[PDB]
């Protein structure tokens, strides 16, 4: 359970740290996130989920890359919305990180990272 820092990853970046042995998707934030993460009706989907169920420490985001095909890896820094791109079969995880289309049945896991102040423990 690692803690790099909190003012070490600037805004428009991300680092796939080898945290605990995984391609996990760090993402530093701005209120420039609840802008546009749920501007889409949920029921146009495999079977949905809401921001408040997603993560309620909402200005530092982390998500796994252990994909439910056989372990595929998405993008860094491209797309139409600005999401994460599966070349394996086909998918683009939007800014909130969800289906637009594809045979991917579900979104994975936001690692159970808890806040207490001065360091956020991932895991």
């Amino acid at each position: 359970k690692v803690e790099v820092n909190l003012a070490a990853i600037p805004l428009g970046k991300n680092v796939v740290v080898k945290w605990q042995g995984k391609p996990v998707f760090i993402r530093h934030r701005t209120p420039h996130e609840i802008q546009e993460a749920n501007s889409v009706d949920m029921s146009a989907l495999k079977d949905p989920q809401t921001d408040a169920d997603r993560v309620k420490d909402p200005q530092w985001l982390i998500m796994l890359g252990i994909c439910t095909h056989l372990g595929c890896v998405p993008i860094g820094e491209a797309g139409d919305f600005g999401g994460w791109f599966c070349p394996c079969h086909g998918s683009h995880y939007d800014i909130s990180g969800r289906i637009r289309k594809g045979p991917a049945p579900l979104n994975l896991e936001i690692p159970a990272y808890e806040f207490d102040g001065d360091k956020v423990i991932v895991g």
Partner: protein, 385 residues
């Protein structure tokens, strides 16, 4: 008496490979079991000599196998004879098992010999899997990832046995160091199951292609079947040498010459060619728990065969219908291995669901039904009431 009969240690050799009574009519299909004993000696010897130069740490493993192939004197001969030797070991075993399935060698009084054989087959699949991971190529990391994650579907004990296999939270350095140490051991457990296997053959002896008693015409082993076994030994070495010296990378995958990368996934992750029929059976069931049960059930379904054969005749020599359906099962096993090397696409999903039903239906439906029909067909053809 002769000294080879009175000495405690030579008496065993005499009783097994010199004076053992054999049926005179056995053919060259009875020579595959001696080859499997040579395969095990090849695989064990070549492995000791490579293990002197190997390093099992995850940052040193891949480059240690290249050190064997570049710097060790006659090191490329040791490895290729090892990698192609295992593919030859599995091909002779599929022929050995299909023989006993044709001539009825599983029936009474040889049920115990057939059950110890099914245990050898399980331990040999395990051995070959563990050693393919000691290379730590790209197929070697991602093959261990998807197989060890199948035990996560066992209820209430799944996530604990996976973290205990891995030694951590992923396929990592503890995983590769323990797979190498398991891999050296299990070949010596196989050698003890082979001794138990031969002991169960000695009390009743071998069968014959006619399926009747052999106690009326017996010849000894020495200089009839010692020199008939020598014919197939030199053909085995000749065909193996052709692959080791002129085509040594045609039965493997190219992506295993890339070092293992947990962050980059390959476009197609497949096992070696001899685990592909069982990989397509797992891929046929759209549920994690039931696919794992069905994959293992495909190996243990061989054990119900002594009970579902309802015939009074041993073997398929004089059987018309049971001979046609023996070869449907053979070519269904080749299509399963071939489906398992394809993509998950239409129509390769339905083709693998029908062909995995024909695998389980042969043992449980087809054999007992046509064997009953053939009994009654022999009766009414002679008895005229």
């Amino acid at each position: 008496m002769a000294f080879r009969k009175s000495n405690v240690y030579l008496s065993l050799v005499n009783s097994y490979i010199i004076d053992s009574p054999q049926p005179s009519s056995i053919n060259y299909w009875w020579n595959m079991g001696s080859l499997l004993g040579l395969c095990l000696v090849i695989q064990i010897v070549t492995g000791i000599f490579m293990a002197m130069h190997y390093s099992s740490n995850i940052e040193l493993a891949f480059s240690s196998v290249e050190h064997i192939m570049r710097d060790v004197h006659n090191g490329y001969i040791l490895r290729y004879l090892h990698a192609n030797g295992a593919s030859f070991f599995f091909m002779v075993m599929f022929m050995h098992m299909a023989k006993g399935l044709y001539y009825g060698s599983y029936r009474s009084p040889r049920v115990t010999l057939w059950n110890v054989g099914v245990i050898i087959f399980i331990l040999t699949i395990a051995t070959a899997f563990l050693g393919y991971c000691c290379v730590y190529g790209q197929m070697s990391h991602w093959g261990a990832t998807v197989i060890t994650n199948l035990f996560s579907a066992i209820p209430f004990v799944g996530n604990d046995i996976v973290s205990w296999l891995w030694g951590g939270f992923s396929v990592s350095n503890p995983t590769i160091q323990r797979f190498f140490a398991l891999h050296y051991l299990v070949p010596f457990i196989i050698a003890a199951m082979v001794i138990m296997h031969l002991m169960a053959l000695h009390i009743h002896g071998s069968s014959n292609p006619l399926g009747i008693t052999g106690n009326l015409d017996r010849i000894p082993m020495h200089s009839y079947f010692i020199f008939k076994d020598l014919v197939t030994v030199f053909l085995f070495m000749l065909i193996l040498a052709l692959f080791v010296f002129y085509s040594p990378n045609t039965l493997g995958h190219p992506d295993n010459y890339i070092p293992g990368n947990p962050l980059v996934t390959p476009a197609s992750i497949v096992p070696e060619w001899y685990l592909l029929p069982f990989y397509a059976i797992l891929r046929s069931i759209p549920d994690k728990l039931l696919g794992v049960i069905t994959m293992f059930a495909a190996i243990l379904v061989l054990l119900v065969l002594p009970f579902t054969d309802r015939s009074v005749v041993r073997g398929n020599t004089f059987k018309v219908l049971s001979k046609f359906f023996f070869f449907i099962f053979v070519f269904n096993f080749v299509l399963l291995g071939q489906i398992g090397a394809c993509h998950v696409e239409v129509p390769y999903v339905l083709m693998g669901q029908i062909a995995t039903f024909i695998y389980f239906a042969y043992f449980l439906i087809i054999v007992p039904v046509i064997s009953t029909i053939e009994n009654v067909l022999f009766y009414i053809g002679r008895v005229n009431k």
